Amino acid sequence: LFASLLGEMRILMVGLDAAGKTTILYKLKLGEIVTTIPTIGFNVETVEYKNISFTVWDVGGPLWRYYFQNTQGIIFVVDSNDRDRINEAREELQSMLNEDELKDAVLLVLANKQDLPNAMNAAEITEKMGLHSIRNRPWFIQATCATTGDGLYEGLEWLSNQVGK
């Protein structure tokens, strides 16, 4: 079970819309998905299991600093079948990677939607996102399918064992 795995105050899971973040959240089975509107046009989905807070919002296109406080892990979910917006995904990851309040957080990239036939594999996304130029920060890419749960654990197993080194 996934509750025993995380046996990190905030895990920020972001990415473009329709990447599957809400589905991954529901697949964790760690509590209800609560959605709040802190400010207008800013939707946030949260799952508080005990002490761990999974914060989710879509990116694309300064109150985020508050969430970046005590964010020990970043999960960047990607639609591996969305070749039209993979460049936009890299630029959004590069944006948050260059946030000084977030450089301490470990990064987990999810090459989601591997079930689709023309989806890019985990290593093509590795290159498209430019992950191999990351330095002074542990990162890990995991091939996942959120609607099934494939790879969701082994990815988050790396995350939980990475924050608690």
Added chain:
Amino acid sequence: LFASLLGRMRILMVGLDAAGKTTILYKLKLGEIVTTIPTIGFNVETVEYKNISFTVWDVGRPLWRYYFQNTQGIIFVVDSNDRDRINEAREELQSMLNEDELKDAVLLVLANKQDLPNAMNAAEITEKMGLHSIRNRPWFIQATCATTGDGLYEGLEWLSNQVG
């Protein structure tokens, strides 16, 4: 003002994506918005306040049958500024109104996003959503802006007394 209204079962708030339904749910302030995924591709936002259940999903499955059994009012949210998709919203409301398990549920229409300059007012939304063709059912349209809550009270007050 909102929480006072529904103090005295199932309310179905449907509409196209980006219509403002999540925004309205947060304005009710009757409880936390809970997102659930009963089946793949079906996202449902729910706000429960003791007796009442505010169910929200996007339109545009035979599973809807079982949400309908005690659905007393349906709130159809439509973005008054989205002129390209207004006909699609008309089709999805017609599919909802032809449903037999919701035949006795009153209809509240919310012409949302009136704050935008090129947004269709409640008059032509009424004309193009086809509310005057509606018989066998009391319906009501209200011009709203869920961002500021403009109009939500007057529309939910009508819903309050029809199902009060």
